[PDB]
Amino acid sequence: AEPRAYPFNDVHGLTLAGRYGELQETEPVSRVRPPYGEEAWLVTRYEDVRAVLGDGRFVRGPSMTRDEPRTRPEMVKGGLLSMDPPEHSRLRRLVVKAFTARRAESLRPRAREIAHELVDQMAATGQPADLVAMFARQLPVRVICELLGVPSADHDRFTRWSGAFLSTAEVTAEEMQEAAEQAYAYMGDLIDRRRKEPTDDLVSALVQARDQQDSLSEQELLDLAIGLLVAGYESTTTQIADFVYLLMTRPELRRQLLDRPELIPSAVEELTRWVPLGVGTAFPRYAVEDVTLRGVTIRAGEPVLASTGAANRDQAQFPDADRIDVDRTPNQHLGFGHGVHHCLGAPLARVELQVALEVLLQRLPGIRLGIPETQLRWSEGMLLRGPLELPVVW
Ligand SMILES: CC[C@H]1OC(=O)/C=C/[C@H](C)[C@@H](O[C@@H]2O[C@H](C)C[C@H](N(C)C)[C@H]2O)[C@@H](C)C[C@@H](C)C(=O)/C=C/C=C/[C@]1(O)CO[C@@H]1O[C@H](C)[C@@H](O)[C@@H](OC)[C@H]1OC
Ligand code: HEM
Numbered sequence: 001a002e003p004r005a006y007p008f009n010d011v012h013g014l015t016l017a018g019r020y021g022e023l024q025e026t027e028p029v030s031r032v033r034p035p036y037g038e039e040a041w042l043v044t045r046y047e048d049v050r051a052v053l054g055d056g057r058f059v060r061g062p063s064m065t066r067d068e069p070r071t072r073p074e075m076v077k078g079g080l081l082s083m084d085p086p087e088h089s090r091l092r093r094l095v096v097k098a099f100t101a102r103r104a105e106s107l108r109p110r111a112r113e114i115a116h117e118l119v120d121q122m123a124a125t126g127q128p129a130d131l132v133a134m135f136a137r138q139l140p141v142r143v144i145c146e147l148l149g150v151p152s153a154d155h156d157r158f159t160r161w162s163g164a165f166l167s168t169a170e171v172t173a174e175e176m177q178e179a180a181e182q183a184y185a186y187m188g189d190l191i192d193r194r195r196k197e198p199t200d201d202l203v204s205a206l207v208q209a210r211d212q213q214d215s216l217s218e219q220e221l222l223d224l225a226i227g228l229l230v231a232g233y234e235s236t237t238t239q240i241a242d243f244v245y246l247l248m249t250r251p252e253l254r255r256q257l258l259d260r261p262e263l264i265p266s267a268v269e270e271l272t273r274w275v276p277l278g279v280g281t282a283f284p285r286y287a288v289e290d291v292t293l294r295g296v297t298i299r300a301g302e303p304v305l306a307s308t309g310a311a312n313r314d315q316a317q318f319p320d321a322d323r324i325d326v327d328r329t330p331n332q333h334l335g336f337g338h339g340v341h342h343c344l345g346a347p348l349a350r351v352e353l354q355v356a357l358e359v360l361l362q363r364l365p366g367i368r369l370g371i372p373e374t375q376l377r378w379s380e381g382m383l384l385r386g387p388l389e390l391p392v393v394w
């Protein structure tokens, strides 16, 4: 009876559903029924979403058993986002000792070179070129190859395997399983090589990482490396396609960044706030005990969807929240999460998104859609929202 069908967002674009603003106003903790899995609470105000994501009483562990609210029939379980302190905390300390802000920044010149190569290839094939296939789907996985220390000769086949892990892939289950097996075997052998002769890449640094006198096991290293790959690939790819879609359809955004390229980092933050990247809200948290939130009792065990897409568009937190203002300040958005699970690749994701906009505007300052905006084909992957193809001219 009472729960609302969720997701509210239409996948065929980046429009924030008007339902979220309505619930922010008058029903900030509400019930939703997803296409698959359990009914759940949905939390939409910036304050409340931040509160749930930062509260020790809201955990992720039950994701390992539960029939989670979701938009696809299958469930992916495990990785860092399935874990709770203290087990989560230990892995996070070790991974961040290796995966530093310094290391992320140090990849900016290689990310620029790879971005320029991808534009070179677009220019070589000629116009219109598909920005999604040729650029957005290529830069983040090649940057992960560079991050981890995959030798250059293996980037193309590593990119091919990794393509099978995207929610937009049309491959068979057996095709995807073969790609997973090859990527895991490849990464294991890469870790064996770096254990034998360390160099200055992330795999070597993960081997060497110590926390107090603790370290990552051989199997933790391999599982965490694969986890970084999936966490850092589809999201960054989709966000690149979405940011350039916005650039190409909003003349003042493009003008402002052509005129003052120094605005690019601020524009990356503002677009990360504005773009409701998720179809709905994934990764439900579970109450460990009864919690009272905005007068509503969330019972021990119940799932709670804390919508960062809605939170980032809350009129109570961001003045004129639906406006894209590249100079917006402050901008304490939740686009890279909040609390203990907050995106650990965020420094790198920011480098990649900044480099993408920098290189495309420098090289292709007239970049624009090659077809009417109403003709764009949107992904029906049901996890993130973005164009399947972006035919561009310049
Ligand atoms: C929307 C992003 C999300 O995408 C996903 O969750 C992607 C899921 C795709 C759609 C899945 O693939 C489908 O599986 C079906 C059973 C068959 C489909 N085909 C073959 C007919 C197939 O397309 C999964 C099962 C693919 C495999 C390789 C996989 O486990 C991928 C995981 C990818 C995870 C993600 O890319 C990243 O999400 C990560 O999920 C982990 C479970 C978390 O721990 C966390 O990682 C650190 C988190 O990142 C922050
Ligand atoms: C634009 C690109 C990206 C976006 C929008 C993004 C967003 C996020 C968000 C919102 C979370 C928290 C999810 C939750 O708590 O429910 C998260 C977690 C994570 N991100 Fe990202 N991310 C991006 C890029 C990357 C990259 C490049 C990497 C790695 C190289 C990465 C690695 C991870 C990992 C490992 C987690 C799980 C952290 C944990 O559970 O402790 N991300 N990301």
Ligand SMILES: [Mg+2]
Binding pocket: 116
């Ligand atoms: Mg050149």
